[PDB]
């Protein structure tokens, strides 16, 4: 079942990528860069999850580590944060320093998750905690300085940014929650339960987010 | 013999790098970035192939030799070659870094599928190989489609040079996955020594040959 | 003791990062990018050294592989910081900056490979890293210093100071490497551990204190 779920996921990622490509052909004022980002996220996640489906992107450590998830997130999650940052900056001057601040925090976050998964006892929760601290700083930037950039770009953009910021932030907190509850953490949730959460969540983050984000930006277009 | 061939290759890479450096000292209107790219490609490839020569950049897997240092080489050298080709198309005009990074992304993915395919067995090997070939087809479509149209937007003389270097590189591109599939990593029709010689001779034309043709053609545009 | 030293180091890195963040809040004409670089260097090094403290970032000769994970990010960022100092108040030369980044990343990789190697092979890789370092030094005191000079007497004086500071530390690393267990094995493991605790405090925090203070002073 776990293999089949991952095959299904990869197919949905492909469909998402194709939808974003078709959107890119009639871009409605959204720069090509934002369509490229929207396409890379699901295609990369799709490839990573395909490796799990084929029984390659996981190994035994007694307990199963789905290491292909970290290979996925270390690329897909910084790209999602870049997408969010470019949305805030839409129609205005770019702040690439702030964008790369978020990328740096996020990459660190995913690495702490991988190391935590390879760790046991207190060490696991030290790494997990450092990842959570990274996430809190990302949230502070998202609803603080990055939102202030969004506000500087007008009422309609700021309203859209706030919506996609809440959307992504809601999903963000779900990942480390599922991680902690599942076999990698406290082991309250069964393996199959965790697998389903990390199949369903990413559909909303790797395709859902970009549908909402691109549609909202496209709606701002005159003509 | 395999060791000696790799020592020889690394020395040729060094000579190529030095030639591009000397060219960079009298640049004839070619930006320093294009000389840097031209130098990094052979130096990186040279280092990777030196590791094979020293007997480090290979190991035994499925009773076959995996020259993993080739993938370490290509994952850096091949995206840089595509960047060189993309900057040639954009020479004397506005840059399209979105298209450039599209090619970089496709190419890095392509090399990764090759590494995973080499580590795989049976149907799984050819699933990864196939995804890499799909990436290459999209690269070729970009190269002779939208990227060539950028070249044409920069005038007859530039477009003529771009088309020449695009054909040169494209011809070499298709050879790599052909040799891969025919050799021990794939169907095993071609002998290991034959594959070794192909992956010594081809790269001399791509790591040095391409940049000689590319830089000379761009330099000729100078008055 | 080795564990305790690494915990202490990671705490100093955290304090350094916090200081640079506080400085960033009243930037005095220094772009946010230079404060971001100053913060990433110690935080990344701190994380890597924490992994050694926890007994994870090494395998047993003992290879402290977490040092290479540290340097492959921290050292290119230090060179970027130095390059941006040279270019302060003038046009950026990102080609020269990325030239230094490329040389430096290659340099650290040769160090890791050399550490995993034995005999003549080890010293071939070590030698390639040294050649990379020499080219970095030639760029630092040649073309990069020329950019600094083009940006006025006060900037050039500050650049020259931080260039000598960083260059002094640079040459120490491959010297200690060669003398220690990774190389000739003349220096004891504990001695090498202390050197690679003390040196980095001066490079990951010291350099940016001197660098940022000097640039901030140009606001007046
Ligand atoms: C794109 C991401 C790729 C996932 C990595 C694939 C796993 C490596 C193969 C392991 C194996 O064959 O046992
Ligand atoms: C990974 C490490 C991150 C450190 C990198 C430095 C930030 C570079 C951003 C360049 C900023 C350009 C101008 C701007 O838009 O702010
Ligand atoms: C691989 C790269 C890893 C990067 C290093 C990991 C930790 C990085 C964190 C630095 C980012 C902190 C920036 C906070 C201040 C932002 C602001 O001024 O608004
Ligand atoms: C500041 C916030 C950083 C810390 C955040 C999360 C802490 C959660 C870790 C607790 C799990 C311990 C369980 C256990 O030890 O069995
Ligand atoms: C613990 C959970 C913390 C997460 C959310 C913090 C929200 C921050 C709100 C804006 C503060 C940033 C600012 O205004 O500069
Ligand atoms: C992990 C693998 C990552 C490899 C990526 C490295 C290769 C990418 C190079 C991109 C170069 C693009 C630089 C644009 C030059 C702009 C200019 O010349 O003005
Ligand atoms: C520059 C890139 C060069 C990379 C080469 C990696 C070679 C690593 C060899 C490790 C030693 C293996 C062995 O001798 O068993
Ligand atoms: C396989 C993973 C590789 C992913 C690396 C690249 C992902 C693409 C992300 C961003 C694209 C950058 C576009 C830069 C826009 C500059 C403006 C322009 O000239 O078009
Ligand atoms: C594979 C062969 C490449 C085909 C090139 C088609 C050109 C596309 C276009 O004109 O947009
Ligand atoms: C022209 C192609 C060169 C290679 C042809 C000979 C193949 C040798 C072999 O079967 O191993
Ligand atoms: C060296 C390997 C390949 C040779 C490539 C072409 C030879 C030089 C031609 C120069 C030119 O076309 O101006
Ligand atoms: C963030 C920087 C961290 C990098 C080093 C992490 C090393 C983790 C290895 C764990 C292996 C083990 O538990 O034995
Ligand atoms: C391997 C990873 C290497 C990471 C180090 C690279 C970062 C270089 C940062 C250069 C930023 C320059 C732009 C600054 C500005 O324009 O303000
Ligand atoms: C690995 C790195 C290989 C070299 C990659 C190329 C990056 C060059 C960046 C070009 C910036 C042009 C603008 C400038 O020179 O200021
Ligand atoms: C250690 C020895 C290595 C070299 C130090 C710097 C060499 C001289 C710098 C370049 C001088 C110049 O270009 O004018
Ligand atoms: C400072 C004091 C120096 C302590 C002694 C140094 C020993 C180096 C040789 C191992
Ligand atoms: C012009 C449109 C280009 C589309 C290419 C999309 C890039 C995807 C990269 C693959 C990553 C997996
Ligand atoms: C053992 C499988 C390794 C696959 C390589 C995936 C790409 C590197 C990690 C993300 C960058
Ligand atoms: C450790 C793996 C490295 C992760 C990096 C993945 C790429 C994310 C960087 C996003 C950059 C896009 C922003 C460009 C601005 C467009 C104008
Ligand atoms: C990932 C570990 C980071 C440790 C802290 C780094 C130093 C302080 C960073 C604070 C950033 C605050 C950004 C929001 C400003 C309002
Ligand atoms: C034992 C099976 C239970 C599966 C539960 C899946 C829950 C998915 C909800 C997504 C958030
Ligand atoms: C997979 C979740 C998709 C959510 C998209 C919502 C519909 C578009 C809103 C505009
Ligand atoms: C992978 C190896 C990286 C090496 C980069 C090549 C750098 C050579 C020096 C660049 C030339 C700049 C000199 C300007 C004066
Ligand atoms: C090995 C067996 C794999 C069977 C499923 C292949 C599906 C490929 C989709 C791309
Ligand atoms: C690497 C696998 C990619 C899967 C499909 C990606 C989405 C479609 C890409 C279309 C190619 C664009 C070429 C431009 C033609 C003009
Ligand atoms: C003018 C139309 C462009 C199509 C070019 C055909 C594809 C080139 C073949 C590449 C293989 C060598
Ligand atoms: C005017 C000089 C101010 C120096 C402040 C030093 C702060 C050091 C931060 C922690 C380093 C360990
Ligand atoms: C047997 C001992 C050989 C040691 C080699 C050390 C020399 C490496 C190059 C030094 C550059 C100055
Ligand atoms: C501590 C190492 C210092 C190396 C540089 C010394 C030579 C610099 C030459 C500059 C020319 C003026
Ligand atoms: C490995 C330890 C060697 C002792 C120190 C060598 C010189 C470095 C500067 C102090
Ligand atoms: C110069 C950089 C600092 C040097 C510190 C040397 C400490 C050596 C202590 C050795 C004690 C016995 C192993
Ligand atoms: Na070019």
mmCIF file of C-alpha atoms in Angstrom, chain A:
data_model
loop_
_atom_site.group_PDB
_atom_site.id
_atom_site.type_symbol
_atom_site.label_atom_id
_atom_site.label_comp_id
_atom_site.label_asym_id
_atom_site.label_seq_id
_atom_site.Cartn_x
_atom_site.Cartn_y
_atom_site.Cartn_z
ATOM 1 C CA UNK A 1 0.000 0.000 0.000
ATOM 2 C CA UNK A 2 2.821 2.387 0.928
ATOM 3 C CA UNK A 3 4.460 1.808 -2.537
ATOM 4 C CA UNK A 4 1.120 2.351 -4.428
ATOM 5 C CA UNK A 5 0.354 5.564 -2.395
ATOM 6 C CA UNK A 6 3.777 6.975 -3.510
ATOM 7 C CA UNK A 7 3.109 6.042 -7.219
ATOM 8 C CA UNK A 8 -0.281 7.862 -6.982
ATOM 9 C CA UNK A 9 1.417 10.920 -5.361
ATOM 10 C CA UNK A 10 4.093 11.109 -8.149
ATOM 11 C CA UNK A 11 1.306 11.010 -10.832
ATOM 12 C CA UNK A 12 -0.575 13.909 -9.083
ATOM 13 C CA UNK A 13 2.761 15.883 -8.958
ATOM 14 C CA UNK A 14 3.142 15.330 -12.774
ATOM 15 C CA UNK A 15 -0.476 16.589 -13.360
ATOM 16 C CA UNK A 16 0.229 19.653 -11.132
ATOM 17 C CA UNK A 17 3.491 20.423 -13.036
ATOM 18 C CA UNK A 18 1.637 20.170 -16.423
ATOM 19 C CA UNK A 19 -1.145 22.535 -15.134
ATOM 20 C CA UNK A 20 1.495 25.154 -14.074
ATOM 21 C CA UNK A 21 3.253 24.765 -17.498
ATOM 22 C CA UNK A 22 -0.091 25.403 -19.336
ATOM 23 C CA UNK A 23 -0.721 28.459 -17.046
ATOM 24 C CA UNK A 24 2.845 29.697 -17.941
ATOM 25 C CA UNK A 25 1.845 29.795 -21.687
ATOM 26 C CA UNK A 26 -0.789 32.531 -20.904
ATOM 27 C CA UNK A 27 1.058 34.130 -17.962
ATOM 28 C CA UNK A 28 -1.276 37.133 -17.198
ATOM 29 C CA UNK A 29 1.446 39.466 -15.793
ATOM 30 C CA UNK A 30 3.174 36.799 -13.589
ATOM 31 C CA UNK A 31 6.931 36.594 -14.390
ATOM 32 C CA UNK A 32 8.262 33.296 -15.900
ATOM 33 C CA UNK A 33 10.431 32.779 -12.733
ATOM 34 C CA UNK A 34 7.281 32.153 -10.584
ATOM 35 C CA UNK A 35 5.975 29.531 -13.123
ATOM 36 C CA UNK A 36 9.453 27.835 -13.181
ATOM 37 C CA UNK A 37 9.457 27.635 -9.318
ATOM 38 C CA UNK A 38 5.821 26.303 -9.299
ATOM 39 C CA UNK A 39 6.847 23.528 -11.801
ATOM 40 C CA UNK A 40 10.200 22.492 -10.164
ATOM 41 C CA UNK A 41 8.569 21.967 -6.685
ATOM 42 C CA UNK A 42 6.123 19.158 -7.717
ATOM 43 C CA UNK A 43 8.497 17.587 -10.345
ATOM 44 C CA UNK A 44 11.323 17.291 -7.718
ATOM 45 C CA UNK A 45 8.889 16.021 -4.999
ATOM 46 C CA UNK A 46 7.414 13.603 -7.629
ATOM 47 C CA UNK A 47 10.895 12.157 -8.439
ATOM 48 C CA UNK A 48 11.795 11.850 -4.690
ATOM 49 C CA UNK A 49 8.474 10.044 -3.878
ATOM 50 C CA UNK A 50 8.905 7.807 -7.004
ATOM 51 C CA UNK A 51 12.210 6.590 -5.391
ATOM 52 C CA UNK A 52 10.200 5.587 -2.233
ATOM 53 C CA UNK A 53 7.536 3.868 -4.457
ATOM 54 C CA UNK A 54 10.387 1.830 -6.121
ATOM 55 C CA UNK A 55 11.727 0.939 -2.606
ATOM 56 C CA UNK A 56 15.018 2.923 -3.037
ATOM 57 C CA UNK A 57 14.381 6.205 -1.098
ATOM 58 C CA UNK A 58 14.076 4.473 2.341
ATOM 59 C CA UNK A 59 16.169 2.092 4.561
ATOM 60 C CA UNK A 60 16.116 0.338 8.012
ATOM 61 C CA UNK A 61 17.727 2.164 11.025
ATOM 62 C CA UNK A 62 14.502 -1.725 13.335
ATOM 63 C CA UNK A 63 12.752 1.518 12.128
ATOM 64 C CA UNK A 64 12.222 2.837 8.519
ATOM 65 C CA UNK A 65 13.851 6.228 7.587
ATOM 66 C CA UNK A 66 12.194 7.752 4.437
ATOM 67 C CA UNK A 67 15.394 9.738 3.610
ATOM 68 C CA UNK A 68 13.992 10.653 0.110
ATOM 69 C CA UNK A 69 11.569 12.992 2.029
ATOM 70 C CA UNK A 70 14.587 15.124 3.165
ATOM 71 C CA UNK A 71 16.090 15.070 -0.397
ATOM 72 C CA UNK A 72 12.615 16.332 -1.530
ATOM 73 C CA UNK A 73 12.154 19.051 1.176
ATOM 74 C CA UNK A 74 15.760 20.450 1.025
ATOM 75 C CA UNK A 75 14.903 21.685 -2.557
ATOM 76 C CA UNK A 76 11.039 21.932 -2.563
ATOM 77 C CA UNK A 77 10.652 23.882 0.775
ATOM 78 C CA UNK A 78 13.198 26.685 0.048
ATOM 79 C CA UNK A 79 11.506 27.038 -3.428
ATOM 80 C CA UNK A 80 8.055 27.381 -1.694
ATOM 81 C CA UNK A 81 9.532 30.124 0.604
ATOM 82 C CA UNK A 82 11.033 31.840 -2.516
ATOM 83 C CA UNK A 83 7.532 31.665 -4.145
ATOM 84 C CA UNK A 84 5.990 33.267 -0.977
ATOM 85 C CA UNK A 85 8.733 35.989 -0.852
ATOM 86 C CA UNK A 86 8.330 36.880 -4.602
ATOM 87 C CA UNK A 87 4.505 37.127 -3.984
ATOM 88 C CA UNK A 88 5.194 39.735 -1.199
ATOM 89 C CA UNK A 89 7.529 41.626 -3.643
ATOM 90 C CA UNK A 90 5.098 41.402 -6.651
ATOM 91 C CA UNK A 91 4.903 44.805 -8.469
ATOM 92 C CA UNK A 92 7.736 46.244 -6.295
ATOM 93 C CA UNK A 93 11.521 46.128 -5.595
ATOM 94 C CA UNK A 94 12.927 42.644 -4.701
ATOM 95 C CA UNK A 95 14.695 42.067 -1.333
ATOM 96 C CA UNK A 96 16.902 39.038 -2.275
ATOM 97 C CA UNK A 97 18.737 39.353 1.116
ATOM 98 C CA UNK A 98 15.440 38.572 2.967
ATOM 99 C CA UNK A 99 14.590 35.842 0.369
ATOM 100 C CA UNK A 100 18.006 34.085 0.881
ATOM 101 C CA UNK A 101 17.672 34.562 4.704
ATOM 102 C CA UNK A 102 14.471 32.411 4.462
ATOM 103 C CA UNK A 103 16.185 29.884 2.087
ATOM 104 C CA UNK A 104 19.134 29.540 4.575
ATOM 105 C CA UNK A 105 16.799 29.099 7.637
ATOM 106 C CA UNK A 106 14.652 26.549 5.698
ATOM 107 C CA UNK A 107 17.585 24.412 4.350
ATOM 108 C CA UNK A 108 19.029 24.344 7.940
ATOM 109 C CA UNK A 109 15.529 23.316 9.208
ATOM 110 C CA UNK A 110 15.311 20.283 6.812
ATOM 111 C CA UNK A 111 18.933 19.210 7.640
ATOM 112 C CA UNK A 112 18.130 19.235 11.444
ATOM 113 C CA UNK A 113 15.123 16.962 10.609
ATOM 114 C CA UNK A 114 17.361 14.448 8.721
ATOM 115 C CA UNK A 115 20.012 14.449 11.528
ATOM 116 C CA UNK A 116 17.216 14.150 14.192
ATOM 117 C CA UNK A 117 15.808 11.092 12.268
ATOM 118 C CA UNK A 118 19.349 9.502 12.287
ATOM 119 C CA UNK A 119 19.689 10.341 16.053
ATOM 120 C CA UNK A 120 18.371 8.584 19.249
ATOM 121 C CA UNK A 121 17.224 9.924 22.680
ATOM 122 C CA UNK A 122 18.009 13.507 23.863
ATOM 123 C CA UNK A 123 20.218 14.106 20.734
ATOM 124 C CA UNK A 124 17.177 13.560 18.411
ATOM 125 C CA UNK A 125 15.151 16.272 20.273
ATOM 126 C CA UNK A 126 18.121 18.744 20.357
ATOM 127 C CA UNK A 127 18.229 18.651 16.498
ATOM 128 C CA UNK A 128 14.355 18.688 16.281
ATOM 129 C CA UNK A 129 14.302 21.760 18.639
ATOM 130 C CA UNK A 130 16.905 23.661 16.485
ATOM 131 C CA UNK A 131 14.658 22.952 13.429
ATOM 132 C CA UNK A 132 11.571 24.288 15.324
ATOM 133 C CA UNK A 133 13.584 27.466 16.285
ATOM 134 C CA UNK A 134 14.432 27.931 12.537
ATOM 135 C CA UNK A 135 10.672 27.507 11.709
ATOM 136 C CA UNK A 136 9.630 30.107 14.383
ATOM 137 C CA UNK A 137 12.108 32.666 12.851
ATOM 138 C CA UNK A 138 10.683 31.876 9.338
ATOM 139 C CA UNK A 139 7.116 32.516 10.723
ATOM 140 C CA UNK A 140 8.308 35.797 12.402
ATOM 141 C CA UNK A 141 9.823 36.961 9.043
ATOM 142 C CA UNK A 142 6.654 35.791 7.142
ATOM 143 C CA UNK A 143 4.169 37.803 9.333
ATOM 144 C CA UNK A 144 6.668 40.624 10.132
ATOM 145 C CA UNK A 145 9.129 42.205 7.638
ATOM 146 C CA UNK A 146 7.981 40.098 4.596
ATOM 147 C CA UNK A 147 4.287 41.053 5.225
ATOM 148 C CA UNK A 148 5.400 44.755 5.510
ATOM 149 C CA UNK A 149 6.919 44.405 1.967
ATOM 150 C CA UNK A 150 3.540 42.936 0.802
ATOM 151 C CA UNK A 151 1.667 45.939 2.374
ATOM 152 C CA UNK A 152 4.067 48.350 0.502
ATOM 153 C CA UNK A 153 2.827 46.763 -2.801
ATOM 154 C CA UNK A 154 -0.866 47.736 -2.309
ATOM 155 C CA UNK A 155 -4.163 46.495 -0.739
ATOM 156 C CA UNK A 156 -4.975 43.744 -3.321
ATOM 157 C CA UNK A 157 -1.438 42.178 -3.346
ATOM 158 C CA UNK A 158 -1.214 42.357 0.519
ATOM 159 C CA UNK A 159 -4.656 40.619 0.856
ATOM 160 C CA UNK A 160 -3.452 37.783 -1.479
ATOM 161 C CA UNK A 161 -0.019 37.496 0.284
ATOM 162 C CA UNK A 162 -1.749 37.231 3.732
ATOM 163 C CA UNK A 163 -4.019 34.398 2.398
ATOM 164 C CA UNK A 164 -1.077 32.328 0.924
ATOM 165 C CA UNK A 165 1.107 33.111 4.025
ATOM 166 C CA UNK A 166 -1.637 31.641 6.334
ATOM 167 C CA UNK A 167 -2.160 28.675 3.891
ATOM 168 C CA UNK A 168 1.589 27.749 3.866
ATOM 169 C CA UNK A 169 2.076 28.534 7.634
ATOM 170 C CA UNK A 170 -0.835 26.153 8.556
ATOM 171 C CA UNK A 171 0.887 23.361 6.513
ATOM 172 C CA UNK A 172 4.394 24.246 7.904
ATOM 173 C CA UNK A 173 3.333 23.509 11.552
ATOM 174 C CA UNK A 174 1.666 20.167 10.463
ATOM 175 C CA UNK A 175 5.020 18.664 9.246
ATOM 176 C CA UNK A 176 7.007 18.824 12.547
ATOM 177 C CA UNK A 177 3.757 17.860 14.421
ATOM 178 C CA UNK A 178 3.362 14.647 12.299
ATOM 179 C CA UNK A 179 7.176 14.045 12.547
ATOM 180 C CA UNK A 180 7.093 14.219 16.417
ATOM 181 C CA UNK A 181 3.888 12.053 16.727
ATOM 182 C CA UNK A 182 5.089 9.395 14.213
ATOM 183 C CA UNK A 183 7.832 6.701 14.326
ATOM 184 C CA UNK A 184 10.689 9.307 13.906
ATOM 185 C CA UNK A 185 9.636 10.914 17.250
ATOM 186 C CA UNK A 186 7.352 9.730 20.125
ATOM 187 C CA UNK A 187 5.958 6.804 18.025
ATOM 188 C CA UNK A 188 2.301 7.456 19.066
ATOM 189 C CA UNK A 189 1.071 7.271 15.401
ATOM 190 C CA UNK A 190 1.472 4.028 13.319
ATOM 191 C CA UNK A 191 3.865 3.997 10.276
ATOM 192 C CA UNK A 192 0.895 3.757 7.806
ATOM 193 C CA UNK A 193 -0.802 6.800 9.510
ATOM 194 C CA UNK A 194 2.433 8.889 9.185
ATOM 195 C CA UNK A 195 2.881 7.726 5.520
ATOM 196 C CA UNK A 196 -0.694 8.918 4.652
ATOM 197 C CA UNK A 197 -0.120 12.346 6.372
ATOM 198 C CA UNK A 198 3.166 12.804 4.358
ATOM 199 C CA UNK A 199 1.231 11.849 1.158
ATOM 200 C CA UNK A 200 -1.815 14.181 1.734
ATOM 201 C CA UNK A 201 -0.029 17.266 3.257
ATOM 202 C CA UNK A 202 2.443 17.600 0.325
ATOM 203 C CA UNK A 203 -0.429 17.507 -2.273
ATOM 204 C CA UNK A 204 -1.701 20.739 -0.599
ATOM 205 C CA UNK A 205 1.839 22.226 -0.292
ATOM 206 C CA UNK A 206 3.432 21.131 -3.616
ATOM 207 C CA UNK A 207 0.363 21.691 -5.846
ATOM 208 C CA UNK A 208 -2.307 23.377 -3.693
ATOM 209 C CA UNK A 209 -0.120 26.360 -2.599
ATOM 210 C CA UNK A 210 0.928 27.229 -6.216
ATOM 211 C CA UNK A 211 -2.691 26.905 -7.552
ATOM 212 C CA UNK A 212 -3.843 29.460 -4.872
ATOM 213 C CA UNK A 213 -0.669 31.632 -5.256
ATOM 214 C CA UNK A 214 -0.578 31.826 -9.119
ATOM 215 C CA UNK A 215 -4.419 32.279 -9.430
ATOM 216 C CA UNK A 216 -4.357 35.188 -6.891
ATOM 217 C CA UNK A 217 -1.436 36.927 -8.723
ATOM 218 C CA UNK A 218 -3.020 36.271 -12.194
ATOM 219 C CA UNK A 219 -6.277 37.927 -10.899
ATOM 220 C CA UNK A 220 -4.284 41.209 -10.314
ATOM 221 C CA UNK A 221 -3.627 41.378 -14.131
ATOM 222 C CA UNK A 222 -5.207 44.305 -16.112
ATOM 223 C CA UNK A 223 -6.660 43.069 -19.489
#
